[PDB]
Each structure stands twice: as structure tokens, then as C-alpha cells.
Amino acid sequence: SYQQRLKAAVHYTVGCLCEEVALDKAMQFSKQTIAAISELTFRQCENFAKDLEMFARHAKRTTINTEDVKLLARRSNSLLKYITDKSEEIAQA
Amino acid sequence: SYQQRLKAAVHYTVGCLCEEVALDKAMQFSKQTIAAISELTFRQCENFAKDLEMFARHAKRTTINTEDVKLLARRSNSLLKYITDKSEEIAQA
Amino acid sequence: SGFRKELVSRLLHLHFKDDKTKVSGDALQLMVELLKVFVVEAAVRGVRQAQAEDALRVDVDQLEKVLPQLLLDF
Amino acid sequence: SGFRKELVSRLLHLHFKDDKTKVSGDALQLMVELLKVFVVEAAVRGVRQAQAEDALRVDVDQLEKVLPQLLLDF
Predict the structure, then answer these.
(1) DSSP states along C5-64
(2) C interface test, pick of B7, B19, B45 with most C CB neighbours within 10 Å
């Protein structure tokens, strides 16, 4: 099923990310916790998508750009620096 | 003091709003609670201001408009309907 | 009952980064309504929480519990 | 380790309101990084919380405590 498939792909990447943190911090995650973060991340995409779409259209555009995306990360100043520094690397590519 | 004055004005309007809710719901607010909401509302204006400012400049404008403001209320669909319906009345004025 | 436009103008202008930034009159009226909604949501959610835990009044403890979700909705 | 661009594209497109909406390649790479940060923040904050209450593992209870602030920061 299409969305079941996308949910499984997210769950797998989240499981990988959590395993890496778990090893780095020497702390275990329950499988229910990994599952919850997966569900959280899937829902969070809805919010990201719609926001990005509104931000592009606010600037009279139909295709989302890196400014729309940086606006999304405006919320925490640390998140802002991380997405702007990540957008400098990507630009050099 | 300038900001103390703005804080007092907010506190007074918040006290009025809270009294009206308190009567409508037959429930009392501590004065510390009214004060906390006042402080909260004052801080919240910082976030509203900077966001509005960023949203206007995202659309290449220096003066904030009603679109910037409706973008601000995008977060909850109920808030979205209330600010769009409130913006129809104001337009009829 | 509600916020005076002049108060809301001063509140916003306190926090703009750029001194050029201005606010349309239309926008300013909408912000007046939005600020009121914010305060009333805070108050109403505070009441619900006090009711839920059977307190005699909305104390700061009850308020604090509803703020995280309040801030997310705004 | 991280998200594949194709996965992130599908995830976004699932939720756009207008079928015209598209995403630049640049933007899409940024979103890949941003989704990764979100997941790692969730995981790292979960760990801190578990440490703070001296649990043997990050269980859902510990996660749930850190989510409200997580969602505010994102």
C-alpha cells in the first residue's frame, strides 16, 4: 500500500538514526519509541509540506525554493544556523 | 518607563479579558495567573512581530499586510478560519 | 473588550529588526483580533485544566500545563 | 546515514494542496538535512530525558515529555 510503504521507509531510516544515537550516547530505545518517532516524523512532513507550499505561494511561486525552506527553520536560531550552513555546502555542489 | 508602560497596558487588557471569561465560565483566576498570561502575551508579540516582518520581506515588502498576518494564523485551521472571517468584516469597513 | 490599536502598534514596533518595517492599517486591525483570541484561548484552556483537576481557581500550575499546546497552535 | 531524496520528495508531494506545487532540487536537499536533524533532536532529547529520570532505556513516556518543546523548535 502506497502510504504504508512510505511509512516503512521512514521507519527504517529512523531506526538507523536512532541506532546511531543510541550507540553514541550508550542508551537503548524501546521499539515502541522508535516507532513513535517514525510516526512523529511522518506527521511532521505534512506540516513542513503545507508550510513550504504556503511560503512559496506567499512569494508568488509554485516551486518551493531554499528561501521557503530556510524560513521553515527560522524558529530556533540554532536550527537557523544549521540549515543555512547546510545550504552553503549544498550550494558548493 | 516605556516598556513598563506597555506591559501595564497589556496587563490591564488581559485582566479585562480574563474577568469576562471568568464570569462566562464561572471560574476564578489567581492574580498570578492573570499576570502570567499578561507576560505571555507580551513575549508572544515579539514572535508575532519578527515573523510578520520576515513574511513581508519574503514577499519583498517593507510594510506588513493582511496576507502576512493570515500566514501567521495558518497553524490551526480553526485559527485560520477565525482570522479570515475577521478579515472579511474589517474589509467591509 | 479588546486591545487598542495604538498599543498593538507599539508592541510590534518594539520588536521589528528593521526601522523601515511598517504595518498596514488592515493588518493592524487583524492583529488586534488575533491578540485577543490568543489571550482568550489561554484563559479558556486554563479554565478547562482547572476544571479537569478540580481546583478552586486557575492557578499558575494549571496555566503552565496548557501553554506548550497553546504556543503550538499560535 | 540519512533520508533518500526520493523518499523526501514523495513525503512532501503527499501533502501539497495544489498539484502544480513543485520543489527545487536545492530545496529538496535542504529538506533531507532538516528531516535528519529533526529525528536526531527527537532521539537526543529522548536520551537526555531518560538520563534525567534514570531509566534503563528511552521508553515512550520519556519521549512524550520532550515532544512539546521539540515541536516548538521546529
Answers:
(1) HHHHHHHHHTT-SSTT-EE-HHHHHHHHHHHHHHHHHHHHHHHHHHHHHT-SEE-HHHHH
(2) B45
